Every structure is written in structure tokens, then in C-alpha cells.
PDB file of all heavy atoms in Angstrom:
ATOM      1  N   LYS A   1       0.820  -1.196  -0.002  1.00 29.34           N
ATOM      2  CA  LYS A   1       0.006   0.014  -0.001  1.00 29.34           C
ATOM      3  C   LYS A   1       0.856   1.235  -0.007  1.00 29.34           C
ATOM      4  O   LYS A   1       0.555   2.207  -0.708  1.00 29.34           O
ATOM      5  CB  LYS A   1      -0.942  -0.001   1.206  1.00 29.34           C
ATOM      6  CG  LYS A   1      -2.052  -1.010   1.110  1.00 29.34           C
ATOM      7  CD  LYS A   1      -2.952  -0.922   2.318  1.00 29.34           C
ATOM      8  CE  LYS A   1      -4.073  -1.928   2.233  1.00 29.34           C
ATOM      9  NZ  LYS A   1      -4.947  -1.855   3.433  1.00 29.34           N
ATOM     10  N   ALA A   2       1.932   1.250   0.780  1.00 30.18           N
ATOM     11  CA  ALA A   2       2.754   2.462   0.915  1.00 30.18           C
ATOM     12  C   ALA A   2       3.562   2.721  -0.349  1.00 30.18           C
ATOM     13  O   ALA A   2       3.891   3.880  -0.631  1.00 30.18           O
ATOM     14  CB  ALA A   2       3.671   2.334   2.116  1.00 30.18           C
ATOM     15  N   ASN A   3       3.915   1.695  -1.103  1.00 29.86           N
ATOM     16  CA  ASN A   3       4.716   1.950  -2.296  1.00 29.86           C
ATOM     17  C   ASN A   3       3.896   2.323  -3.517  1.00 29.86           C
ATOM     18  O   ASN A   3       4.452   2.431  -4.611  1.00 29.86           O
ATOM     19  CB  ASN A   3       5.585   0.742  -2.641  1.00 29.86           C
ATOM     20  CG  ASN A   3       6.695   0.532  -1.656  1.00 29.86           C
ATOM     21  OD1 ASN A   3       7.298   1.496  -1.182  1.00 29.86           O
ATOM     22  ND2 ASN A   3       6.991  -0.720  -1.360  1.00 29.86           N
ATOM     23  N   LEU A   4       2.596   2.544  -3.364  1.00 28.78           N
ATOM     24  CA  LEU A   4       1.736   2.826  -4.502  1.00 28.78           C
ATOM     25  C   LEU A   4       0.925   4.107  -4.365  1.00 28.78           C
ATOM     26  O   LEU A   4       0.028   4.348  -5.165  1.00 28.78           O
ATOM     27  CB  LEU A   4       0.776   1.649  -4.765  1.00 28.78           C
ATOM     28  CG  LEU A   4       1.446   0.392  -5.267  1.00 28.78           C
ATOM     29  CD1 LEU A   4       0.462  -0.744  -5.321  1.00 28.78           C
ATOM     30  CD2 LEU A   4       2.066   0.633  -6.606  1.00 28.78           C
ATOM     31  N   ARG A   5       1.223   4.928  -3.366  1.00 31.67           N
ATOM     32  CA  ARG A   5       0.487   6.185  -3.185  1.00 31.67           C
ATOM     33  C   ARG A   5       0.841   7.225  -4.240  1.00 31.67           C
ATOM     34  O   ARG A   5       0.117   8.201  -4.399  1.00 31.67           O
ATOM     35  CB  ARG A   5       0.738   6.756  -1.800  1.00 31.67           C
ATOM     36  CG  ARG A   5       0.192   5.896  -0.704  1.00 31.67           C
ATOM     37  CD  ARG A   5       0.541   6.509   0.628  1.00 31.67           C
ATOM     38  NE  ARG A   5       1.995   6.514   0.829  1.00 31.67           N
ATOM     39  CZ  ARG A   5       2.610   7.116   1.840  1.00 31.67           C
ATOM     40  NH1 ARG A   5       1.906   7.799   2.741  1.00 31.67           N
ATOM     41  NH2 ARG A   5       3.931   7.066   1.924  1.00 31.67           N
ATOM     42  N   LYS A   6       1.949   7.054  -4.963  1.00 32.34           N
ATOM     43  CA  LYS A   6       2.307   7.982  -6.011  1.00 32.34           C
ATOM     44  C   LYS A   6       1.577   7.661  -7.307  1.00 32.34           C
ATOM     45  O   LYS A   6       1.221   8.553  -8.066  1.00 32.34           O
ATOM     46  CB  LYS A   6       3.820   7.976  -6.228  1.00 32.34           C
ATOM     47  CG  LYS A   6       4.602   8.409  -5.014  1.00 32.34           C
ATOM     48  CD  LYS A   6       6.079   8.333  -5.268  1.00 32.34           C
ATOM     49  CE  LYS A   6       6.527   6.890  -5.357  1.00 32.34           C
ATOM     50  NZ  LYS A   6       6.320   6.132  -4.096  1.00 32.34           N
ATOM     51  N   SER A   7       1.371   6.406  -7.582  1.00 32.31           N
ATOM     52  CA  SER A   7       0.791   6.031  -8.851  1.00 32.31           C
ATOM     53  C   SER A   7      -0.695   5.774  -8.722  1.00 32.31           C
ATOM     54  O   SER A   7      -1.164   5.294  -7.674  1.00 32.31           O
ATOM     55  CB  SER A   7       1.474   4.787  -9.421  1.00 32.31           C
ATOM     56  OG  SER A   7       2.814   5.055  -9.722  1.00 32.31           O
ATOM     57  N   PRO A   8      -1.482   6.087  -9.757  1.00 36.23           N
ATOM     58  CA  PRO A   8      -2.912   5.699  -9.745  1.00 36.23           C
ATOM     59  C   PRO A   8      -3.059   4.242 -10.172  1.00 36.23           C
ATOM     60  O   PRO A   8      -2.652   3.874 -11.270  1.00 36.23           O
ATOM     61  CB  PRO A   8      -3.521   6.663 -10.766  1.00 36.23           C
ATOM     62  CG  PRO A   8      -2.397   7.039 -11.668  1.00 36.23           C
ATOM     63  CD  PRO A   8      -1.153   7.009 -10.838  1.00 36.23           C
ATOM     64  N   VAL A   9      -3.661   3.456  -9.302  1.00 34.45           N
ATOM     65  CA  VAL A   9      -3.922   2.054  -9.609  1.00 34.45           C
ATOM     66  C   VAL A   9      -5.397   1.848  -9.784  1.00 34.45           C
ATOM     67  O   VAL A   9      -6.224   2.672  -9.370  1.00 34.45           O
ATOM     68  CB  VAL A   9      -3.376   1.122  -8.499  1.00 34.45           C
ATOM     69  CG1 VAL A   9      -1.877   1.271  -8.392  1.00 34.45           C
ATOM     70  CG2 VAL A   9      -4.031   1.426  -7.182  1.00 34.45           C
ATOM     71  N   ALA A  10      -5.751   0.749 -10.446  1.00 34.74           N
ATOM     72  CA  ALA A  10      -7.151   0.398 -10.592  1.00 34.74           C
ATOM     73  C   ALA A  10      -7.653  -0.318  -9.352  1.00 34.74           C
ATOM     74  O   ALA A  10      -6.888  -0.948  -8.617  1.00 34.74           O
ATOM     75  CB  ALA A  10      -7.362  -0.489 -11.825  1.00 34.74           C
ATOM     76  N   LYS A  11      -8.941  -0.187  -9.104  1.00 35.78           N
ATOM     77  CA  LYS A  11      -9.509  -0.631  -7.829  1.00 35.78           C
ATOM     78  C   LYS A  11      -9.842  -2.126  -7.787  1.00 35.78           C
ATOM     79  O   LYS A  11     -10.242  -2.597  -6.714  1.00 35.78           O
ATOM     80  CB  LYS A  11     -10.774   0.169  -7.511  1.00 35.78           C
ATOM     81  CG  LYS A  11     -10.498   1.624  -7.143  1.00 35.78           C
ATOM     82  CD  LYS A  11     -11.764   2.352  -6.781  1.00 35.78           C
ATOM     83  CE  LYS A  11     -11.500   3.814  -6.436  1.00 35.78           C
ATOM     84  NZ  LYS A  11     -12.735   4.558  -6.106  1.00 35.78           N
ATOM     85  N   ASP A  12      -9.690  -2.841  -8.890  1.00 38.51           N
ATOM     86  CA  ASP A  12      -9.893  -4.286  -8.883  1.00 38.51           C
ATOM     87  C   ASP A  12      -8.617  -5.073  -8.603  1.00 38.51           C
ATOM     88  O   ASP A  12      -8.624  -6.303  -8.766  1.00 38.51           O
ATOM     89  CB  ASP A  12     -10.479  -4.744 -10.242  1.00 38.51           C
ATOM     90  CG  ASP A  12      -9.662  -4.252 -11.411  1.00 38.51           C
ATOM     91  OD1 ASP A  12      -8.740  -3.429 -11.192  1.00 38.51           O
ATOM     92  OD2 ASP A  12      -9.923  -4.684 -12.542  1.00 38.51           O
ATOM     93  N   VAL A  13      -7.532  -4.405  -8.230  1.00 39.24           N
ATOM     94  CA  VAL A  13      -6.300  -5.083  -7.872  1.00 39.24           C
ATOM     95  C   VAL A  13      -6.367  -5.547  -6.429  1.00 39.24           C
ATOM     96  O   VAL A  13      -6.613  -4.750  -5.511  1.00 39.24           O
ATOM     97  CB  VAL A  13      -5.102  -4.142  -8.089  1.00 39.24           C
ATOM     98  CG1 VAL A  13      -3.826  -4.816  -7.684  1.00 39.24           C
ATOM     99  CG2 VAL A  13      -5.041  -3.717  -9.542  1.00 39.24           C
ATOM    100  N   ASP A  14      -6.159  -6.832  -6.215  1.00 42.49           N
ATOM    101  CA  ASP A  14      -6.310  -7.475  -4.909  1.00 42.49           C
ATOM    102  C   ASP A  14      -4.921  -7.592  -4.286  1.00 42.49           C
ATOM    103  O   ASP A  14      -4.218  -8.575  -4.551  1.00 42.49           O
ATOM    104  CB  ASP A  14      -6.981  -8.833  -5.051  1.00 42.49           C
ATOM    105  CG  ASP A  14      -7.460  -9.386  -3.717  1.00 42.49           C
ATOM    106  OD1 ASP A  14      -7.297  -8.725  -2.692  1.00 42.49           O
ATOM    107  OD2 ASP A  14      -7.990 -10.503  -3.725  1.00 42.49           O
ATOM    108  N   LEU A  15      -4.542  -6.643  -3.458  1.00 44.74           N
ATOM    109  CA  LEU A  15      -3.190  -6.614  -2.909  1.00 44.74           C
ATOM    110  C   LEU A  15      -3.027  -7.683  -1.832  1.00 44.74           C
ATOM    111  O   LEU A  15      -1.920  -8.176  -1.611  1.00 44.74           O
ATOM    112  CB  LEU A  15      -2.881  -5.242  -2.343  1.00 44.74           C
ATOM    113  CG  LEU A  15      -2.932  -4.137  -3.388  1.00 44.74           C
ATOM    114  CD1 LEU A  15      -2.733  -2.800  -2.735  1.00 44.74           C
ATOM    115  CD2 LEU A  15      -1.894  -4.372  -4.455  1.00 44.74           C
ATOM    116  N   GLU A  16      -4.117  -8.031  -1.152  1.00 43.72           N
ATOM    117  CA  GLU A  16      -4.055  -9.050  -0.098  1.00 43.72           C
ATOM    118  C   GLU A  16      -3.724 -10.415  -0.665  1.00 43.72           C
ATOM    119  O   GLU A  16      -3.039 -11.222  -0.041  1.00 43.72           O
ATOM    120  CB  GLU A  16      -5.382  -9.110   0.654  1.00 43.72           C
ATOM    121  CG  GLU A  16      -5.669  -7.885   1.508  1.00 43.72           C
ATOM    122  CD  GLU A  16      -6.325  -6.758   0.739  1.00 43.72           C
ATOM    123  OE1 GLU A  16      -6.605  -6.929  -0.477  1.00 43.72           O
ATOM    124  OE2 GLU A  16      -6.563  -5.692   1.350  1.00 43.72           O
ATOM    125  N   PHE A  17      -4.181 -10.676  -1.899  1.00 46.41           N
ATOM    126  CA  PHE A  17      -3.834 -11.914  -2.583  1.00 46.41           C
ATOM    127  C   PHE A  17      -2.341 -11.959  -2.882  1.00 46.41           C
ATOM    128  O   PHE A  17      -1.706 -13.014  -2.727  1.00 46.41           O
ATOM    129  CB  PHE A  17      -4.667 -12.029  -3.849  1.00 46.41           C
ATOM    130  CG  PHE A  17      -4.451 -13.286  -4.607  1.00 46.41           C
ATOM    131  CD1 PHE A  17      -4.951 -14.481  -4.126  1.00 46.41           C
ATOM    132  CD2 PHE A  17      -3.784 -13.266  -5.809  1.00 46.41           C
ATOM    133  CE1 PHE A  17      -4.766 -15.657  -4.838  1.00 46.41           C
ATOM    134  CE2 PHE A  17      -3.608 -14.434  -6.528  1.00 46.41           C
ATOM    135  CZ  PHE A  17      -4.091 -15.626  -6.048  1.00 46.41           C
ATOM    136  N   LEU A  18      -1.773 -10.841  -3.321  1.00 46.87           N
ATOM    137  CA  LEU A  18      -0.330 -10.743  -3.549  1.00 46.87           C
ATOM    138  C   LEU A  18       0.451 -10.994  -2.263  1.00 46.87           C
ATOM    139  O   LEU A  18       1.425 -11.753  -2.270  1.00 46.87           O
ATOM    140  CB  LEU A  18       0.041  -9.379  -4.082  1.00 46.87           C
ATOM    141  CG  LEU A  18      -0.259  -9.052  -5.548  1.00 46.87           C
ATOM    142  CD1 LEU A  18       0.038  -7.604  -5.810  1.00 46.87           C
ATOM    143  CD2 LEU A  18       0.599  -9.916  -6.417  1.00 46.87           C
ATOM    144  N   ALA A  19       0.014 -10.404  -1.180  1.00 48.44           N
ATOM    145  CA  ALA A  19       0.725 -10.562   0.081  1.00 48.44           C
ATOM    146  C   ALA A  19       0.548 -11.976   0.628  1.00 48.44           C
ATOM    147  O   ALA A  19       1.416 -12.471   1.383  1.00 48.44           O
ATOM    148  CB  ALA A  19       0.277  -9.544   1.093  1.00 48.44           C
ATOM    149  N   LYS A  20      -0.530 -12.648   0.275  1.00 46.68           N
ATOM    150  CA  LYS A  20      -0.681 -14.034   0.683  1.00 46.68           C
ATOM    151  C   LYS A  20       0.219 -14.942  -0.154  1.00 46.68           C
ATOM    152  O   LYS A  20       0.668 -15.985   0.338  1.00 46.68           O
ATOM    153  CB  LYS A  20      -2.139 -14.482   0.584  1.00 46.68           C
ATOM    154  CG  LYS A  20      -2.995 -13.953   1.714  1.00 46.68           C
ATOM    155  CD  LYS A  20      -4.455 -14.359   1.558  1.00 46.68           C
ATOM    156  CE  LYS A  20      -4.655 -15.819   1.879  1.00 46.68           C
ATOM    157  NZ  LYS A  20      -4.401 -16.105   3.319  1.00 46.68           N
ATOM    158  N   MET A  21       0.488 -14.567  -1.403  1.00 42.22           N
ATOM    159  CA  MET A  21       1.254 -15.479  -2.285  1.00 42.22           C
ATOM    160  C   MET A  21       2.739 -15.430  -1.991  1.00 42.22           C
ATOM    161  O   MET A  21       3.445 -16.427  -2.178  1.00 42.22           O
ATOM    162  CB  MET A  21       0.968 -15.172  -3.734  1.00 42.22           C
ATOM    163  CG  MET A  21      -0.374 -15.700  -4.155  1.00 42.22           C
ATOM    164  SD  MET A  21      -0.323 -17.502  -4.041  1.00 42.22           S
ATOM    165  CE  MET A  21      -2.055 -17.898  -4.066  1.00 42.22           C
ATOM    166  N   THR A  22       3.248 -14.296  -1.529  1.00 41.44           N
ATOM    167  CA  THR A  22       4.681 -14.124  -1.352  1.00 41.44           C
ATOM    168  C   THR A  22       5.057 -14.405   0.105  1.00 41.44           C
ATOM    169  O   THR A  22       4.444 -13.892   1.031  1.00 41.44           O
ATOM    170  CB  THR A  22       5.102 -12.710  -1.713  1.00 41.44           C
ATOM    171  OG1 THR A  22       4.557 -11.797  -0.745  1.00 41.44           O
ATOM    172  CG2 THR A  22       4.541 -12.357  -3.055  1.00 41.44           C
ATOM    173  N   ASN A  23       6.089 -15.236   0.293  1.00 41.82           N
ATOM    174  CA  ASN A  23       6.552 -15.584   1.622  1.00 41.82           C
ATOM    175  C   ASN A  23       7.959 -15.063   1.921  1.00 41.82           C
ATOM    176  O   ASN A  23       8.159 -14.331   2.884  1.00 41.82           O
ATOM    177  CB  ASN A  23       6.502 -17.084   1.835  1.00 41.82           C
ATOM    178  CG  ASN A  23       5.133 -17.584   2.138  1.00 41.82           C
ATOM    179  OD1 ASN A  23       4.409 -16.970   2.921  1.00 41.82           O
ATOM    180  ND2 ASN A  23       4.762 -18.703   1.567  1.00 41.82           N
ATOM    181  N   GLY A  24       8.925 -15.441   1.111  1.00 38.91           N
ATOM    182  CA  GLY A  24      10.279 -15.043   1.389  1.00 38.91           C
ATOM    183  C   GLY A  24      10.698 -13.712   0.831  1.00 38.91           C
ATOM    184  O   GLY A  24      11.903 -13.429   0.785  1.00 38.91           O
ATOM    185  N   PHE A  25       9.757 -12.895   0.393  1.00 38.15           N
ATOM    186  CA  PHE A  25      10.136 -11.621  -0.200  1.00 38.15           C
ATOM    187  C   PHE A  25      10.467 -10.615   0.869  1.00 38.15           C
ATOM    188  O   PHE A  25       9.904 -10.627   1.983  1.00 38.15           O
ATOM    189  CB  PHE A  25       9.027 -11.042  -1.087  1.00 38.15           C
ATOM    190  CG  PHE A  25       8.864 -11.738  -2.424  1.00 38.15           C
ATOM    191  CD1 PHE A  25       7.963 -11.253  -3.331  1.00 38.15           C
ATOM    192  CD2 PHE A  25       9.683 -12.780  -2.800  1.00 38.15           C
ATOM    193  CE1 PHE A  25       7.812 -11.853  -4.555  1.00 38.15           C
ATOM    194  CE2 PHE A  25       9.536 -13.371  -4.022  1.00 38.15           C
ATOM    195  CZ  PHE A  25       8.588 -12.913  -4.904  1.00 38.15           C
ATOM    196  N   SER A  26      11.402  -9.720   0.565  1.00 38.42           N
ATOM    197  CA  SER A  26      11.697  -8.569   1.398  1.00 38.42           C
ATOM    198  C   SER A  26      11.040  -7.323   0.800  1.00 38.42           C
ATOM    199  O   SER A  26      10.280  -7.393  -0.170  1.00 38.42           O
ATOM    200  CB  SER A  26      13.202  -8.379   1.524  1.00 38.42           C
ATOM    201  OG  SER A  26      13.746  -8.079   0.262  1.00 38.42           O
ATOM    202  N   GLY A  27      11.337  -6.173   1.390  1.00 35.90           N
ATOM    203  CA  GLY A  27      10.729  -4.935   0.929  1.00 35.90           C
ATOM    204  C   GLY A  27      11.238  -4.498  -0.446  1.00 35.90           C
ATOM    205  O   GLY A  27      10.510  -3.939  -1.251  1.00 35.90           O
ATOM    206  N   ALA A  28      12.517  -4.794  -0.728  1.00 31.53           N
ATOM    207  CA  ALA A  28      13.088  -4.432  -2.001  1.00 31.53           C
ATOM    208  C   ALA A  28      12.469  -5.219  -3.127  1.00 31.53           C
ATOM    209  O   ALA A  28      12.320  -4.701  -4.258  1.00 31.53           O
ATOM    210  CB  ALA A  28      14.599  -4.633  -1.959  1.00 31.53           C
ATOM    211  N   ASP A  29      12.073  -6.464  -2.866  1.00 32.51           N
ATOM    212  CA  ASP A  29      11.459  -7.289  -3.908  1.00 32.51           C
ATOM    213  C   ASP A  29      10.084  -6.751  -4.276  1.00 32.51           C
ATOM    214  O   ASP A  29       9.711  -6.707  -5.449  1.00 32.51           O
ATOM    215  CB  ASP A  29      11.375  -8.716  -3.414  1.00 32.51           C
ATOM    216  CG  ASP A  29      12.738  -9.322  -3.178  1.00 32.51           C
ATOM    217  OD1 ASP A  29      13.680  -8.909  -3.874  1.00 32.51           O
ATOM    218  OD2 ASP A  29      12.860 -10.192  -2.294  1.00 32.51           O
ATOM    219  N   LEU A  30       9.303  -6.336  -3.257  1.00 33.85           N
ATOM    220  CA  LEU A  30       7.985  -5.776  -3.524  1.00 33.85           C
ATOM    221  C   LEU A  30       8.086  -4.462  -4.256  1.00 33.85           C
ATOM    222  O   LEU A  30       7.280  -4.162  -5.176  1.00 33.85           O
ATOM    223  CB  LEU A  30       7.255  -5.626  -2.206  1.00 33.85           C
ATOM    224  CG  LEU A  30       7.126  -6.963  -1.468  1.00 33.85           C
ATOM    225  CD1 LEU A  30       6.529  -6.756  -0.096  1.00 33.85           C
ATOM    226  CD2 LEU A  30       6.299  -7.918  -2.265  1.00 33.85           C
ATOM    227  N   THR A  31       9.089  -3.653  -3.908  1.00 30.70           N
ATOM    228  CA  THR A  31       9.330  -2.404  -4.633  1.00 30.70           C
ATOM    229  C   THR A  31       9.725  -2.668  -6.078  1.00 30.70           C
ATOM    230  O   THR A  31       9.305  -1.959  -6.995  1.00 30.70           O
ATOM    231  CB  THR A  31      10.372  -1.590  -3.908  1.00 30.70           C
ATOM    232  OG1 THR A  31       9.956  -1.433  -2.548  1.00 30.70           O
ATOM    233  CG2 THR A  31      10.526  -0.219  -4.518  1.00 30.70           C
ATOM    234  N   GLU A  32      10.490  -3.740  -6.311  1.00 30.19           N
ATOM    235  CA  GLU A  32      10.878  -4.123  -7.651  1.00 30.19           C
ATOM    236  C   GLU A  32       9.675  -4.551  -8.500  1.00 30.19           C
ATOM    237  O   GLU A  32       9.581  -4.194  -9.676  1.00 30.19           O
ATOM    238  CB  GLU A  32      11.895  -5.242  -7.589  1.00 30.19           C
ATOM    239  CG  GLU A  32      12.359  -5.751  -8.937  1.00 30.19           C
ATOM    240  CD  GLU A  32      13.180  -4.714  -9.704  1.00 30.19           C
ATOM    241  OE1 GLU A  32      13.845  -3.869  -9.042  1.00 30.19           O
ATOM    242  OE2 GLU A  32      13.143  -4.728 -10.954  1.00 30.19           O
ATOM    243  N   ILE A  33       8.752  -5.289  -7.884  1.00 30.07           N
ATOM    244  CA  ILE A  33       7.524  -5.712  -8.574  1.00 30.07           C
ATOM    245  C   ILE A  33       6.680  -4.506  -8.987  1.00 30.07           C
ATOM    246  O   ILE A  33       6.237  -4.398 -10.132  1.00 30.07           O
ATOM    247  CB  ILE A  33       6.708  -6.656  -7.665  1.00 30.07           C
ATOM    248  CG1 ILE A  33       7.459  -7.980  -7.480  1.00 30.07           C
ATOM    249  CG2 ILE A  33       5.364  -6.940  -8.271  1.00 30.07           C
ATOM    250  CD1 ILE A  33       6.840  -8.817  -6.412  1.00 30.07           C
ATOM    251  N   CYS A  34       6.497  -3.564  -8.040  1.00 29.86           N
ATOM    252  CA  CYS A  34       5.724  -2.368  -8.337  1.00 29.86           C
ATOM    253  C   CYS A  34       6.359  -1.521  -9.433  1.00 29.86           C
ATOM    254  O   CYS A  34       5.680  -0.981 -10.304  1.00 29.86           O
ATOM    255  CB  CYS A  34       5.535  -1.536  -7.061  1.00 29.86           C
ATOM    256  SG  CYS A  34       4.627  -2.359  -5.788  1.00 29.86           S
ATOM    257  N   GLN A  35       7.706  -1.449  -9.428  1.00 30.09           N
ATOM    258  CA  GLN A  35       8.405  -0.663 -10.430  1.00 30.09           C
ATOM    259  C   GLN A  35       8.297  -1.288 -11.808  1.00 30.09           C
ATOM    260  O   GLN A  35       8.138  -0.571 -12.804  1.00 30.09           O
ATOM    261  CB  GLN A  35       9.853  -0.475 -10.002  1.00 30.09           C
ATOM    262  CG  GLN A  35      10.630   0.450 -10.872  1.00 30.09           C
ATOM    263  CD  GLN A  35      12.035   0.699 -10.339  1.00 30.09           C
ATOM    264  OE1 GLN A  35      12.409   0.157  -9.313  1.00 30.09           O
ATOM    265  NE2 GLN A  35      12.801   1.499 -11.057  1.00 30.09           N
ATOM    266  N   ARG A  36       8.378  -2.631 -11.894  1.00 29.75           N
ATOM    267  CA  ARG A  36       8.226  -3.275 -13.204  1.00 29.75           C
ATOM    268  C   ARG A  36       6.802  -3.105 -13.742  1.00 29.75           C
ATOM    269  O   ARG A  36       6.612  -2.965 -14.957  1.00 29.75           O
ATOM    270  CB  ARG A  36       8.587  -4.739 -13.130  1.00 29.75           C
ATOM    271  CG  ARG A  36      10.034  -5.017 -12.892  1.00 29.75           C
ATOM    272  CD  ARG A  36      10.309  -6.492 -12.855  1.00 29.75           C
ATOM    273  NE  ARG A  36      10.112  -7.106 -14.163  1.00 29.75           N
ATOM    274  CZ  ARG A  36      11.073  -7.208 -15.074  1.00 29.75           C
ATOM    275  NH1 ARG A  36      12.283  -6.709 -14.842  1.00 29.75           N
ATOM    276  NH2 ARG A  36      10.810  -7.769 -16.260  1.00 29.75           N
TER     277      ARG A  36
END
């Protein structure tokens, strides 16, 4: 949530599903996903 306040996202994106799917990720990995 905090890494996406600059960009406009669509409201059908389920971020909780993403956070449930990722286990060993760190903060830099999530920032890399958002940037790509």
C-alpha cells in the first residue's frame, strides 16, 4: 500500500492476494515488482 500512493492504480487489484502469495520476499522485492 505504501509503495503505490504515487501512482494511480485500478480498484480491482487485490493486494491481499499478492501478500498471501509471497513468503520469502523482502521490501526491495515488492518495490521491484511495483516498479516493473
Side-chain angles (χ1 to χ4, degrees):
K1 289 181 180 179
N3 289 323
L4 291 174
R5 294 177 295 171
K6 298 178 290 297
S7 294
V9 298
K11 290 182 180 178
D12 53 351
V13 178
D14 193 2
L15 299 175
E16 291 85 2
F17 183 73
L18 285 173
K20 284 178 74 67
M21 284 295 163
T22 68
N23 281 318
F25 285 184
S26 64
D29 296 330
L30 302 174
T31 305
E32 180 67 29
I33 294 169
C34 297
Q35 187 175 0
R36 291 181 68 88

